[PDB]
Amino acid sequence: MKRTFQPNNRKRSKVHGFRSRMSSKNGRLVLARRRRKGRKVLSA
Amino acid sequence: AVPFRRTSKMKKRLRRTHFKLNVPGMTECPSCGEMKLSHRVCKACGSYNGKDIN
Amino acid sequence: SYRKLGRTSAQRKAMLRDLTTDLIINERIETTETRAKELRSVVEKMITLGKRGDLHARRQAAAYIRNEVANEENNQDALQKLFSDIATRYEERQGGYTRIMKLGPRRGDGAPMAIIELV
Amino acid sequence: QAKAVARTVRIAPRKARLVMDLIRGKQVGEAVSILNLTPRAASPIIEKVLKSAIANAEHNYEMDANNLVISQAFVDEGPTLKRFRPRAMGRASQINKRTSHITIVVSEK
RNA sequence: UUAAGUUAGAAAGGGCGCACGGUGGAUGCCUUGGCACUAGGAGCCGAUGAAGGACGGGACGAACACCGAUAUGCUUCGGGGA
RNA sequence: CCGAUAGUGAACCAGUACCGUGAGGGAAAGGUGAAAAGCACCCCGGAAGGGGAGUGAAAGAGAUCCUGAAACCGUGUGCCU
RNA sequence: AACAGUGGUAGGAGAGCGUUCUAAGGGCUGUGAAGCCAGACCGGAAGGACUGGUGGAGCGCUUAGAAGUGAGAAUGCCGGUAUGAGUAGCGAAAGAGGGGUGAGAAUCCCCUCCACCGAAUGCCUAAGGUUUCCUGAGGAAGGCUCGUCCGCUCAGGGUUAGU
RNA sequence: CGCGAGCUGGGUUCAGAACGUCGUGAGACAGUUCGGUCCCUAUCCGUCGCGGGCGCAGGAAAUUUGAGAGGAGCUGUCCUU
RNA sequence: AAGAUGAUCAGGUUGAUAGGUCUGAGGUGGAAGUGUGGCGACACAUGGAGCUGACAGAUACUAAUCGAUCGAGGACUUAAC
Structure with a gap:
């Protein structure tokens, strides 16, 4: 089923950027x- | 079922006895040869008693 | 007995209805071996209906021959080729219409190919 | 006496000892015909080595090539590739892509 | 010829000994590097925009190293001499 | 003190590759020869891969490229089954 | 020299053999060092030596000293190779026939029959992906099998907005 | 208390959940009750069938003999006497 | 007829081993087509018709071609011949 890296350009770059x-x-x-x-x- | 103890280097070879493949029944074409196998049309000329069926 | 050929009972009918048509167009096919030996039992029934030529006899034969134009520029169907060409040739012969000649095995699977020719 | 060496063509060894054991002892008129018809599809790897071994004995020594007895035919496991093939429940087992070294020493009667 | 008998050998394949091999990189040496220290010098760069990085530059497109739209470099002052 | 499973993790385009959403974890990988002299030419092969020919002291030195052990995998075997 | 002794865990004592480096000289190496493999040789053992072959540049002896000083067991660590074993598995789901390509074809291309989804297995375009797109060559490697083929490899080409 | 690498879990004795009782409380009870992932590609010896060698003083084809091995081994009525 | 493959058994052109083709047996149960009754849906006749998987008996018409491989020369002591 659903796994944990539902990829985001935005939310990756805002939390971790x-x-x-x-x-x-x-x-x-x-x-x-x-x-x-x-x-x-x-x-990252 | 998990193999309780490894097969030694004798027993491993003793099942290779009947594992050998065998010869094909081979004869020559009376047209060309060499050679044909038994009862089946050769790739050599393609004759088979003796019509030149390519 | 009959041969299962690894196909479902409807898959075998679509199997055999193709191959019997392709003997009509090609005059010879290179199937596999038990696709050869099991094909002669049908075609020698199907050519037997060719010698009759009834309006009833052709309508039995249309269930094993498909709709494929056989000769270009004459527009003959494979149904037409039986009653026009093949039956005019086998009024001498009583059985044994397609002789089978074995060829060697095939490369990619080791399968024994075989050559069927009518005669 | 002549020698041809294959050196790292991808096949398993045990899938080529079986092709080989209809050769060791045979003749050139008794092996090229037999290897073409085994069918055992590691055969034309070897049949491009035996026939190349004869045409070594053709050019390099002229040993009357149609009259040769095949003497040594050993095959050794060469440099093994190794790949990981994935598996369910996180197992990730291995696939050993083997490689062999075919040597067909062809010699005079 | 028959009877009553004693023992060899055969090897589809295998055991041990030896000879020749192949994967394997390990003992040898050998360092390009590292690790400890000594004696000395240096102990700070940054709004005249730093340490650190992206984009890039070569007749050759990748990368390393040098460099900044003056970009595989520019002056000048010295050393150097094919 | 170490001599490449040691010594920094890194003698090798290493905090690289990969692993993690992320803070982070984090490898393996040295040696042809004295120099490329790195195998012109012929034969087999589609082509790799070989066999002759030359190169050098060595070619068994020819791309994991000095040494090459053992497990292993072979092939012949002298004696036993 | 006489007389007696001489199993042995935990343990105490004593004597030795090894390996690496340093210090004295003394002594082997291209007429072949170390290491490797062989062998029927010698001491009480740990252990040494000698001849052969490989190996192609270092090495031992004695005498002391320093110690990252010795391997069979850590469900140890790393790497390699087995065993099972030519065994389980080859990831739902119809192809068949002719021709062509090529060295090689069931798996590549074309044609013709047939078959499956058809409120999806159709199209359009987000989230993402970052060239997987197209052409022209290859084909070792990844394709769970081949393979002239590919979303693989190379070499070029490829995305045009005032709405 | 034969038999789960032959099967079923219905109870006991996983967590959930209640009821009585006990304890101040967490919870407890061989006191009760509803629900609750039973994994394994057979290496060896066994077992049951099928084959390939070899031997049986030369090779062959039929039919056998039986030392030995198993299987079968149960009985109820009824009528006459 | 046997059967997982091996094996067994029927057989290999002085041949029936298999397939086909005929003649059947069993099975289905009134073919198409034609004509007629019916406006029609349908029925009726040709006609136990038509259709038939392994089931039987004939038929070389087809495939069992060519050919190859394996396999003896009989130890010797004694007794009687």
Whole structure:
């Protein structure tokens, strides 16, 4: 039956996207550990 | 049913005895050969007692 | 006995009604082996109706021959080809209308192909 | 004496030991006719190796090619491909695409 | 010739020994890299828009590395000499 | 101190691939030769794949490309069934 | 030299063999080192040596010292290969015949008969997908089988808005 | 208390749900009641049928003998005497 | 007639083994077509008609062609011949 990635361009990009994680100070620590590790795909 | 203990390298080969395939019954065409099989029309010339049925 | 041929009892009728028509057009077919041996039992009944030529005899034969134009430029149906061509040739012969000649097996499935020719 | 080697044509070995065991000991006039009619569709892999082994003995040594006795015919499992094939309930079993090495050593009577 | 008898061999296939092979990468050596430290220098970049990245640039379309619509580069001052 | 199942996770286009909606988890993968001299030409083959020919010390060195073990898979077998 | 002893778990003591590296010199290597495979050789064992073959550049001995110092068992870890086994499975659901392509055809193309959905298996266009679209070649790999074929591989081409 | 890799779960003894009783309460009860995923492609030995070798002092075709192995092994009426 | 495949059994052109074709048996039960009665739906005649899967008996008309493979030379001690 129904599975959990019912794909959205909008809702993916608003919950998990960039400015949502430049928003809060706890959200920018997500953009610190995504930088000190040095990933390529910063927050999806 | 799950196989209780692995088959050794003897018993594995002992079921390969009758597993061998066999020869086809083969003769030659009296037109060309070589060779035909038994009672069925050859691919060689296609004659079969002896009409040249391609 | 008869042969089941892996087909339903209606699938066999659509099976055999095609192949008996294709002997009329082609004069020879390369079926599989037990599609050959099981076809001779029907055509030698179907050519037997050809020798009669009644208005009743043709209307038995239309249930095993379809509606397919056989010769171009004369517009003959395969029904017409029996009573015009085939029956004019077999007034000498009493049975054994289609001899079967076995060919070798087929590549992709190992199936024994077989050649049917009328005679 | 001559030698032809196949080297990594995709077939299983056990599906080619069976084609092979109507060859080891036979003759050139007794194997090319037999391999064409087994039918056992790993045959023309081998029949393009035996006939290539004879036309090695044709060109390279001229060993009177119609008078040859086939001496060695061993086949070894070559470099195995391995693929994962999915399965229900999250099993995801394996499919081992085997490969074999056909060697038909053809020699004089 | 018959009787009464004793033992060989046969191998569809297999067991062990040996010879020649094939998948397999492991012991060898060998590092391109890493790990600990020492002696010293450096210990900060950012609204004259940073660290970090997207789009891109080559006669060659991908990518790496360099670079920014002056884009596989531009001056100038030195080193360098085919 | 390590010598590629070690040493950083990364000697290799590694935080890559993949796995997760997402925070995150997170690999494997070294070596032709002294240099490409990387096999012109002939034969088989549709073509890979071989056999001769040359190349080099080696070609069994020819693309997982130095060494190549064992499990395994073979083929011949001397003796036993 | 005489006399006596000499099974053994948990455990205590003693003596040794191994491997890697460093330190003294001394000593083998292209006239072939290490490692590999063989073999009927020697000591109480752990273990050593020798000849052959492969291997193509490093290596042992003694004497001490340091230790990532020894493998059969962790439902250990990783990789490889078996067994089952040519076995279960090959993912609902009709094709058949002629021709063509090609080396090869049931599975590719064309034609002709037949058959199925037809308030869906039709079209149009969202959510998504990001070239899967078209042509021209291939065909190893993915296609649960072939395969000249493909939503596979390549090489080009491909989306036009004041409504 | 034969027999679930031969079957059925009707009860006991999974969670749900009630009733009496007990406990202050969570809940409890061999006190009762309605509902409640029974998985396995047979390796070996067995069992029951079918075959291929080989042997039976030369190869062959028929019919056999029987050491041995099983199967069958139950009885009620009625009438006469 | 046997049967999962092997096997068994009927047979391989001095042949009936199978299919067809005839003549039947059983089965269905009044074909089409034609004419007639009926405005018609239908009935009636030709006519136990027509149609028939393995069921029987004939018929070489078809397929069982060609051909190949396997298979003995009989150990020796003694007793009587």
